Amino acid sequence: SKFQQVEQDVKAIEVSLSARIGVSVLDTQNGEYWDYNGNQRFPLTSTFKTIACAKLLYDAEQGKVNPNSTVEIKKADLVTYSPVIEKQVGQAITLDDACFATMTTSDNTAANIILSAVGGPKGVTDFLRQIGDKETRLDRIEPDLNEGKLGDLRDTTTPKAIASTLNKFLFGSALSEMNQKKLESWMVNNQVTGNLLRSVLPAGWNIADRSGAGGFGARSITAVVWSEHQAPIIVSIYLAQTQASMEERNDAIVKIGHSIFDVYTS
Numbered sequence: 001s002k003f004q005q006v007e008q009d010v011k012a013i014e015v016s017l018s019a020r021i022g023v024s025v026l027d028t029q030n031g032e033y034w035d036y037n038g039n040q041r042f043p044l045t046s047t048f049k050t051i052a053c054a055k056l057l058y059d060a061e062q063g064k065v066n067p068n069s070t071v072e073i074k075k076a077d078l079v080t081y082s083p084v085i086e087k088q089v090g091q092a093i094t095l096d097d098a099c100f101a102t103m104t105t106s107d108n109t110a111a112n113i114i115l116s117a118v119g120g121p122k123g124v125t126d127f128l129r130q131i132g133d134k135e136t137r138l139d140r141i142e143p144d145l146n147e148g149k150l151g152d153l154r155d156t157t158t159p160k161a162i163a164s165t166l167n168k169f170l171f172g173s174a175l176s177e178m179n180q181k182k183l184e185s186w187m188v189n190n191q192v193t194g195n196l197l198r199s200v201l202p203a204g205w206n207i208a209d210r211s212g213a214g215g216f217g218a219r220s221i222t223a224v225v226w227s228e229h230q231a232p233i234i235v236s237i238y239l240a241q242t243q244a245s246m247e248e249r250n251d252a253i254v255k256i257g258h259s260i261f262d263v264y265t266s
Contacts, residue, residue, distance in 0.1 A: 002032075002034070002263055003025070003034040003260075003263060005259050005262065005263075006023070006025075006034070006036075006256065006259040006260055006263065007036055009255055009256055009259045010023055010036045010256055011036075013239075013252045013255065013256065017217075017239070017242045017244040017248060017249070017252060018242060018243070019217065019239050019240065019241060019242035019244065020037070020040065020042070020239070020240045020241050020242075021036070021037060021237075021238065021239050021240075021252070022035070022036065022037035022038055022040045022042055022158065022159040022236075022237075022238045023035060023036045023037070023038065023159055023235075023236065023237050023238075023256060023260075024038045024158075024159035024160040024162075024163040024234075024235075024236040025163075025233065025234070025235055025236075025260055026163050026164070026167055026233065026234040026235075027231070027233050028167065028171060028231050028232045028233065028234070029230075029231030029232075029233075033160075035159060035160055037159070038158060038159045038160040039158050039160060040158060040159070041135075041153065041156045041157070041158055042156060042157065042158070042159070042218070042220065042238035042239075042240045043145075043146065043147070043148040043155055043156055043212075043214050043215075043218045043220075043238075043240060044136070044138065044145070044155050044156060044157050044162075044212065044220075045145070045146050045148065045155075045212030045213060045214035045218050045220060046106050046111075046210065046211060046212035046213070047157070047162060047210050047211065047212040047220055047221070047222045048124070048136075048138050048145070048155065048157075048212075049102050049103060049106065049111050049114075049210060050103070050166065050169070050183070050187065050210045050222065051124055051127070051128065051136070051138070051165070051169075052099075052102075052111060052114045052115055052118060052124055052138075053099040053102070053103055053114060053183065053186060054169045054175065054183055055118040055119075055123070055124060055127045056095055056096075056099055056114055056117065056118055057175055057179040057182060057183060058127065058174065058175060058179075059117075059118055060179075061175070061176060061179065065095065065117055065118070066095075067094065067095045067096040067099075068094050068095070068096060069094065069095060070092035070093060070094050070095075071092060071093060071094075071095065071098070071113050071116075071117070072091075072092050073085055073088050073089055073090065073091055073092065073093055073109075073113075074089065074090075075089050075090075077109055077112070077113075078109050079108045079109050079112065079142050079143055080108060080142075080143050081106070081107070081108050082107045082108050082109035082110065083105050083107055084101035084105055084107045084110055085098075085101065085107055085109040085110050085113075086109070093110075093113070095113070095114065095117050098110040098113045098114050099114055099186060100186060102114060103186035103187065103189075103190065103210065104186065104189050104190055104191050104192070105191055105192055106192055106211075108142035108143060109142070111141075111142050112141050112142050115141055120141070121138040121139045121140060121141065121145075121155075124138040125137045125138055125139070128165065131165060131168055131169075131172075131174055132164075132168070133157075133161050133162075133164065133165045134161070135156075135157055135158050135161035136156070136157035136158075136161050136162055136165060137153065137154070137155065137156060137157070138155055139154035139155050140154060140155055146213075146214035146215055146218070147214070147215050148214040148215035148216045148217075148218040148240060148241075149215065149216060150216070150240075150241050159236040159237070159238055160236070162222055162236050163222065163234045163235070163236035164234075166222055166224060166234055166236075167232075167234050169183060170183065170184055170208070170224060170232075171232065184208050184224075187208035187209055187210055187223075187224070188206065188207070188208045190208075190209055190210060190211075192211070193209050193210075193211045193221065195250050195254075196209070196211055196221050196250060196253050196254065196257070197209060197221060197223050197225070197235070197253065197254070197257040199254055200254050200257050200258040200261065201225065201257075201261070202227070202261050202264075202265050204227050204228070205225055205226065205227040205230070205261075206225065206226050206227065207223055207224070207225045208223065208224045208225075209221055209222065209223035209224070210222050210223070213246065213249075216240065216241045216242070217239065217240065217241060217242035217243060217244055217249065218238075218239065218240050218241075219238075219239045219240075219242075219246070219249035219250070219252075219253065220236075220237060220238040220239065221235075221236075221237050221253055222234075222235070222236050223235045225261070230264055233260075233264065235257065235260055237253055237256055237257070239252060239253075
């Protein structure tokens with residue numbers, strides 16, 4: 001009953017936006033969890049980027065790759081929306097800087113550069129299986145992975161699976177404390193989600209997030225929020241197959257986020 005208002009708000013949105021919507025909330029402090037369509041599948045879109053960069057750090061720890069090695073940027077590699085990389089054609093960028101780029105701006109070419117360095121979609125998926133995520137899967141690179149068609153299993157996750165995976169990445173021991181802080185900082189320094197959860201975040205709270213937008217109205221966000229008096233809470237919100245405008249989909253996320261935060265601020 002704690003999340004009753006949240007459920008009601010999610011139900012109103014699924015009606016008004018005639019959409020498929022899923023939410024998962026994990027309270028690390030007391031081991032509590034709640035979801036609505038938490039086992040349903042939704043397109044990952046840019047929320048996968050966190051996984052690719054987490055794998056870069058993991059692979060680096062094992063010595064599979066040097067995060068400081070550079071990769072040559074060529075004009076033919078450029079894909080839609082690559083603000084950081086489009087200014088560095090003819091130059092070399094380190095894998096670490098490519099992760100900073102894609103995590104803070106969602107730069108798509110930067111994401112493909114990371115994918116080519118960590119075994120591509122197949123390597124990413126195998127990594128997910130190893131950490132215990134049995135649902136999430138990456139199958140294509142940018143931009144094709146954003147198709148978001150109903151029933152397509154490619155490049156999807158469930159609100160609960162990705163929430164659990166983010167929990168392990170940042171608070172488990174798969175990554176060193178150093179790499180956990182690095183991954184966290186990349187999410188904390190995200191520059192492109194000001195109109196989502198950050199806009200309704202309680203005074204004094206912190207947030208590490210990664211969002212996504214794709215075909216057929218796909219919109220989502222995976223975040224971790226916390227404060228001096230509030231242990232980490234993982235939030236996963238996904239919308240799919242809706243004709244709603246981007247503003248309406250952002251509105252949905254801020255309304256749901258607001259209700260979720262209220263559970264803890266009240």
